[PDB]
Ligand SMILES: CC(C)(C)CC(C)(C)c1ccc(OCCOCCO)cc1
Ligand SMILES: CC(C)(C)CC(C)(C)c1ccc(OCCOCCO)cc1
Ligand SMILES: CCCCCCCCCCCCCC(=O)O
Ligand SMILES: *[C@@H]1O[C@H](CO)[C@@H](O)[C@H](O)[C@H]1NC(C)=O
Ligand SMILES: *[C@@H]1O[C@H](CO)[C@@H](O)[C@H](O)[C@H]1NC(C)=O
Ligand SMILES: *[C@@H]1O[C@H](CO)[C@@H](O)[C@H](O)[C@H]1NC(C)=O
Ligand SMILES: [Cl-]
């Protein structure tokens with residue numbers, strides 16, 4: 001069988017294209033996954049500073065990159081800083 | 096990780112990879128195959144985790160297939176400066192941008208090789224014609240080495256794990272040799288998607304950290320196959 005198969009139209013605005021896929025997923029599961037990847041790898045104080053200066057961090061990354069993350073975090077009720085940190089989980093520990 | 100691009104006796108290019116990462120129990124439930132569309136038509140196919148907008152395994156139908164493996168080299172503060180002061184690109188986002196904008200296997204290997212990054216990585220690319228298969232060892236500024244297929248010379252497969260291919264694999268984490276050995280036994284004659292999938296299922300190439308195994312061929316896009324693994 002394999003994993004599920006979803007479509008993601010790239011003609012819809014970045015904030016809305018990933019939302020039809022999230023409907024199929026329990027919000028609690030995703031929010032627990034983010035908390036597991038961040039809480040285990042990131043100290044609480046680092047998470048604090050990134051949460052306070054998230055917008056300054058956002059102005060640097062590609063617009064369509066942060067726009068797809070932002071639209072999902074507004075749907076799941078997650079903090080945009082928690083969304084950018086998992087989407088940069090590789091760049092956070094790859095050195 | 097473990098990415099493998101190989102060429103069979105008749106001249107077809109096959110591509111498969113293993114994605115080894117902690118937090119497996121959670122990510123196996125979020126793994127998905129995503130078919131990004133354009134004007135209604137599939138523009139490319141990728142495998143990611145719900146909530147992760149980048150791609151570490153993708154396929155542009157009838158053009159190329161690309162996958163990424165981790166390359167830890169440098170210092171922590173090089174990723175900070177590369178991302179903040181220099182506005183470099185993430186690894187999983189450049190891999191997706193290429194699957195979307197690159198028009199040919201040659202343009203896909205150019206972007207993946209020259210585009211500045213925040214951190215190092217191994218980009219393993221495959222194609223639709225024979226001898227189209229390279230392993231791009233990336234710095235943050237540009238490419239550090241490009242390892243091409245050379246069948247007539249006795250190199251019909253490229254095995255990339257998480258270390259430079261011109262150096263001896265560490266004794267603690269040597270998933271290269273068993274992948275090579277199992278590819279030597281399979282033989283260039285009987286190389287197919289299912290026989291490649293078996294190579295990626297050989298311990299320790301298939302370890303407790305393996306989350307999913309993908310096998311694909313740019314020339315036969317409909318055969319894209321991902322299987323979530325439950326190691327034990
Ligand atoms: C998904 C939401 C509504 C929760 C988040 C926000 C407010 C950011 C939103 C709100 C509306 C929205 O629609 C954009 C349609 O534009 C098409 C041409 O650009 C996209 C996003
Ligand atoms: C915004 C981030 C921090 C999530 C991502 C960037 C790329 C800027 C990053 C990524 C990694 C990074 O390394 C610092 C590790 O922290 C503890 C030091 O021992 C620093 C920054
Ligand atoms: C909803 C949260 C899901 C995102 C969890 C973090 C995902 C990070 C994946 C990084 C892939 C590592 C590259 C590799 O295979 O070595
Ligand atoms: C969403 O988040 C806001 C602010 O963090 C909070 O006030 C609200 O109760 C949350 N609602 C749900 C359904 O999680
Ligand atoms: C995805 O889109 C294609 C064509 O754009 C359609 O035929 C197919 O049914 C869709 N798949 C899913 C799983 O929705
Ligand atoms: C997982 O770890 C256990 C304990 O070391 C080992 O016996 C087992 O073979 C490992 N599984 C895989 C798939 O490597
Ligand atoms: Cl099967």
Ligand SMILES: [Cl-]
Pocket residue numbers: none
């Ligand atoms: Cl449904």
Ligand SMILES: [Cl-]
Pocket residue numbers: 096115302304
């Ligand atoms: Cl490993």
Ligand SMILES: [Cl-]
Pocket residue numbers: 157158223313314
């Ligand atoms: Cl073709």
Ligand SMILES: [Cl-]
Pocket residue numbers: 168169170
């Ligand atoms: Cl260095």
Ligand SMILES: [Cl-]
Pocket residue numbers: 191192195
């Ligand atoms: Cl894109």
Ligand SMILES: [Cl-]
Pocket residue numbers: 196197198199202
């Ligand atoms: Cl191009």
Ligand SMILES: [Cl-]
Pocket residue numbers: 205206209210
């Ligand atoms: Cl470029």
Ligand SMILES: [Cl-]
Pocket residue numbers: 236237238
């Ligand atoms: Cl250079």
Ligand SMILES: [Cl-]
Pocket residue numbers: 254255256257258259260264271
């Ligand atoms: Cl290697």
Ligand SMILES: [Cl-]
Pocket residue numbers: 166167168257258259
């Ligand atoms: Cl290295």
Ligand SMILES: [Cl-]
Pocket residue numbers: 001002322323
């Ligand atoms: Cl299965």
